[PDB]
Structure formats: C-alpha cells, structure tokens
Design an enzyme around this catalytic site. Sequence first.
Site, PDB file in Angstrom:
ATOM      1  N   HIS B  40     -47.422  -8.911 -23.912  1.00  0.00           N
ATOM      2  CA  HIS B  40     -46.705  -7.778 -23.341  1.00  0.00           C
ATOM      3  C   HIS B  40     -47.193  -7.411 -22.008  1.00  0.00           C
ATOM      4  O   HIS B  40     -46.834  -6.347 -21.504  1.00  0.00           O
ATOM      5  CB  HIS B  40     -46.757  -6.567 -24.280  1.00  0.00           C
ATOM      6  CG  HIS B  40     -48.110  -5.955 -24.421  1.00  0.00           C
ATOM      7  ND1 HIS B  40     -49.004  -6.345 -25.399  1.00  0.00           N
ATOM      8  CD2 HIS B  40     -48.718  -4.964 -23.723  1.00  0.00           C
ATOM      9  CE1 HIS B  40     -50.104  -5.618 -25.299  1.00  0.00           C
ATOM     10  NE2 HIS B  40     -49.964  -4.787 -24.279  1.00  0.00           N
ATOM     11  N   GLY B 142     -55.393  -0.066 -20.331  1.00  0.00           N
ATOM     12  CA  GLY B 142     -55.915  -1.262 -19.705  1.00  0.00           C
ATOM     13  C   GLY B 142     -57.042  -1.929 -20.455  1.00  0.00           C
ATOM     14  O   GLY B 142     -57.671  -2.845 -19.910  1.00  0.00           O
ATOM     15  N   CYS B 144     -56.288  -3.407 -23.244  1.00  0.00           N
ATOM     16  CA  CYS B 144     -55.570  -4.519 -23.849  1.00  0.00           C
ATOM     17  C   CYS B 144     -56.125  -5.850 -23.365  1.00  0.00           C
ATOM     18  O   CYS B 144     -56.528  -5.995 -22.209  1.00  0.00           O
ATOM     19  CB  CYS B 144     -54.087  -4.430 -23.519  1.00  0.00           C
ATOM     20  SG  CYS B 144     -53.291  -3.111 -24.403  1.00  0.00           S
TER      21      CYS B 144
END
Lengths: 299, 299
Positions: B40, B142, B144
């Site tokens: 994503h 952030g 991720c």
Amino acid sequence: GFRKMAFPSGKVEGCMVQVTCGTTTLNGLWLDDVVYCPRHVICTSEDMLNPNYEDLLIRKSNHNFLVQAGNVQLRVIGHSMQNCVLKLKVDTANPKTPKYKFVRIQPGQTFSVLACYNGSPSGVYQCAMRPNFTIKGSFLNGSCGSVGFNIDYDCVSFCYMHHMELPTGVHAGTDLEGNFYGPFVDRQTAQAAGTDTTITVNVLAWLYAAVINGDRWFLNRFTTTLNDFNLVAMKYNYEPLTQDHVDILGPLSAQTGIAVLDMCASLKELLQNGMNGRTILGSALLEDEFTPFDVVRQC
Amino acid sequence: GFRKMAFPSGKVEGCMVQVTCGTTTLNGLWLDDVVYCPRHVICTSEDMLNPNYEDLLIRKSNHNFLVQAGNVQLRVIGHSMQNCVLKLKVDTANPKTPKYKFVRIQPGQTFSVLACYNGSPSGVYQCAMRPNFTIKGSFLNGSCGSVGFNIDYDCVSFCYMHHMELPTGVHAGTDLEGNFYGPFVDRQTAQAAGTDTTITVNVLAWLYAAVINGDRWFLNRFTTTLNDFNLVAMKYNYEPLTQDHVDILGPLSAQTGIAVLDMCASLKELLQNGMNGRTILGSALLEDEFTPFDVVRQC
Ligand SMILES: [Zn+2]
Ligand SMILES: [Zn+2]
Ligand SMILES: [Zn+2]
Ligand SMILES: [Zn+2]
C-alpha cells in the site's frame, strides 16, 4: 500503541569484545585503541572478598589480558586503572567505532542496555537509573562489562557499565570513567541500596502517554496544588515534583490540553485509592521508567 | 533479574531502507537485490478506502519507486506483487545482508520489532503474536514496513512486517511473503480482531522465571489436573494447556523442582482469587509475552 523501547543496538554491537585475565572472563567496550572493562576481571573469586586492586593489578602485565573480538585477538600494549574500570590500550583502533561520548546520567533518566555474554550481544532492553542509583536489570553470570547507552542520532552516549549484582538481587555499576552510581564498591560484601522512590515526573509522563493513546479513565474532576501534591508524594515514596518537572511535561501538557497539576490530582487519587483492578496502558501499576522525552519520541 | 528483552538489532539496521512512491513513504527491507515493503505504498489516502491493488500497480512502473538507503538511491529494475508485499528488484545487492530466512511464526510466539521511520531505525522492543493474530505494538505514522525478527545466532529469521493499525488501536501485518497474520486485509475498513486470549503456556513460563528469581509467594499447597486446570482456563479466556506445553515447560520444571501441574494449581488460584495487590517479578498482572524459550535464555 505504547511499549518500553530500547535504542537500536547496532552501533554498540560492533564495540563489544571479550576480556579474559586468569579464568575470569567478562565483556569489554572497544572504542578507538582502548578496551574498557570492569577492573574486577583481575580478581579470582577469593580476591572479591576483600580486593586491594592496585596490589592485584601490579601482579598483572599486558600479556595477562586476553582481549578478543569474535575470533580475533587484540594485542594489549598498555594497561591503566581509572577508578573501577580497566583501560586496555591495544594496537588496532576499532574500525566500527561510532561517534561516541561518555556521560554520567542522572537518577531518573533512562538508557538502553546491550546485555552480553563473553563478548557476544544477547539482547537489548530499556531501563532507568533508579533514584537510589541501582538498576533493575537482567544480568546473568558473565554479563559484567555490558554497557548502557543512549543514541541522540549521530553519536552514542555511553552512560553505564555493569559491575555487580547486590544481595538484594538488584544491579549496580559505573559510568565509563569508572565511578559507581551510588554508594557501591566493587567488593563482595553486604551493601545497602537504601530506600528506592518512584520517579514522579516519569509517572506523570506515562499518564500523558496514556491519555494520548486513549486510556483516560483515571482523569478526575479535581485539581490540586504542587505542595499538597508533594505532601502525598512523600507518603507514597515518590520523588517530589518541581517546577522543572512541570516544564518538561509542558509539551505533553500542550498536546493533551491537560494542565500538569490536573494530572497531579488524578495521580493523587490513584495513589490514595489504588487502581481498583483496572489497567493503564495495560499495566496494573504506576510505571516510572519512561522519561518525558521517552514518551515524546513515541508520540 | 528479569526483563522483556529484544534481540540485538544490528544485523537488521543495515537492511532498512526508505521507499517512496507518490507522496506515500514507508520503510523497506533490502536483502540481496530485493527490497520488500508493504504494497500500500502505491496507495493514496483515497485509494485506501477500497484499493484494487493489481489495477493501482499497473499505473506504476519501476521509475515510480524511490528506494533510498541513508543518502543513496537504488535503481529499481523490476517490481512484483507477492500477496500484500511489493518486491522491488534493484541493481545492487545489499552488502550488509546477513544470513536470513523468512518464517511465518505461530500464534503465541515472540519476536523483536525494529521500529523505523522513513528508513531510519528508531527503537527495538520484544512482542508476541497474540492468539487472535494481532500484536500490541508501538507504530507511529510511517512505521509501516518495520519488520519483526528472531535471531538464532548466525541468521535472522524475519517473521513480520507491519501493515496496519486497526480501529481497536492494535496492530496487524504479514509475514515476509505477504500473507496477513489473521483475517485482516490491507484496506481502510472496519475489521474485527475477535476475542484475544491469554497465552497460557507463556504465563506458566513466567511464573517459573519468577520462582527462579526468588518470587514464589504464589506457590500453593494444592495441585490439580490438566482438564480441571483447563476448565478454569476457558473461564478466564486462557488458551487450553496441552501436553506439548507441559513438555516445553520441562526444563524449567527440572530446574525448579516444581511439577507443571503444581504450577497450574497456583495459576488457578491467582485467576480465581486475583493477586491481592501484590506483584510477581514487579508486575501486578499475569504476563504472557515470554515463551518458555524466552525465559530459558534469561536463566
Ligand atoms: Zn563481575
Ligand atoms: Zn550526539
Ligand atoms: Zn501504511
Ligand atoms: Zn539460523
């Protein structure tokens, strides 16, 4: 979410070496052309009952110290005793030496420990310098020489080296110049830690973390004053809160819209009424090993 | 002493990179000539409401992916979608690539997370794969792409990559082949974690740690049977105990001289009577994020 978080330990892993001198083997910290380790590496088990370290160190020359990095020996070419640490000057500078400083930290501040066994890093965890200058750690045999550090993104501040478990099961050590935190000496005798007190400003930072993360049940409709808040602090062995502590909590206050004293009031009722079986951030007790800076970096 | 301990994170720090594609920027894992990141990264904020990932990925070519290591760009020369992860083939192999494997771990097992922000490691902490396949972590925006791993001394087993915070505030992600742990999908919709249950075998390992470390107040004069122990487990949402779990606890049993069922009996009375305001290993609640292996390495 919110967890107890250590710094990344890579810059320190490359500094850990194994130091032997006799049958006694512990960890060392290799920075530039110097290896640092606790001086009681020169001690037998008998020696530890009442060591005269200068005298013990005289019977030792360079070639008695076995400094090893992984599977490489480093030639010792000079040895010094600075307080309770041995400075083993060697021929080759550590290529992986980061930018570093040695700092003595203050009671109530936190740091990361790289727990090691015979020069090998085994794990990393965050901990606090308790007010009574002990640390509640995790130190098996041969973990001596493990270092505590903070990383302020470019350089590693080394603030701790482990020397001792005390008869309480709690931990004591020095800064990297060899000075004990607290009244402790590197000798195997009875040694009191004295009364340990909760790090009040830290506990408040945790509640602020809790509010930020959605747990705010402990919030009250009361408020309080600083001196009367401190009148309950002394009762529950909490460090007294100062205006500095209030200022440090400022950014967390400015984010939560919750004035510091209002938080001090909710803390008051948790101390005099307990927590009724509920949890804050998944803890059933008041957590004091996060500085306001620790909480801020996680928010 | 006894603390929640993460593995040394150096071998993983050298693998973290920053990945950008549009304005969306997250972390990636550079091993050999491949960077892995959550797919994503190709999504806008609007996209996340209902992403068709194959379709979104078609509008993207190699030169849309900005892969950066510190201050160096890596040229992407091939992109693939494997389940919920993007495999960004690049020109230069990572020189710091350790020996590694990708393993999908089992619910109840623990691993270390290297929490990162725009390709930079900020901290490390230990956590467990909750039975309902979530993790209680610490993941700012952030974060991720941050990976979970275990180190079995020579190689890094990568077992987790963070993809999502869920509306519960708890965390979900995939193995390094892109398969979610649990029923979660990388889409911004309502998603239930389902009932989470305590990792019984872990709790028992903790009590064994406690006994080893001197805390043994919870020890009882009763004993119990496995099925009747499990009759109380279901009541208090605890995973049922099996003979395997009893076997894993074996070495801790053989060290403490405390038979597993005798421990199950003390656990029983803590569950039906609570802990009366006392603590075990400094926790006022029952701790389930230490495997028997975790406890063993600390003893
Ligand atoms: Zn020692
Ligand atoms: Zn600095
Ligand atoms: Zn994301
Ligand atoms: Zn391996």
